[PDB]
Design a protein around this nucleic acid. Structure first.
Length: 10
DNA sequence: GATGCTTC
DNA sequence: GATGCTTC
């Protein structure tokens, strides 16, 4: 997730 | 070191 | 099955 904690996603 | 899901 | 790395 994020970044942080990508997206999701990417 | 945690860490985290979403679309692709 | 592949992604996507940061801020915390």
């Amino acid at each position: 997730t994020x970044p942080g904690v990508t997206x999701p996603g990417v």
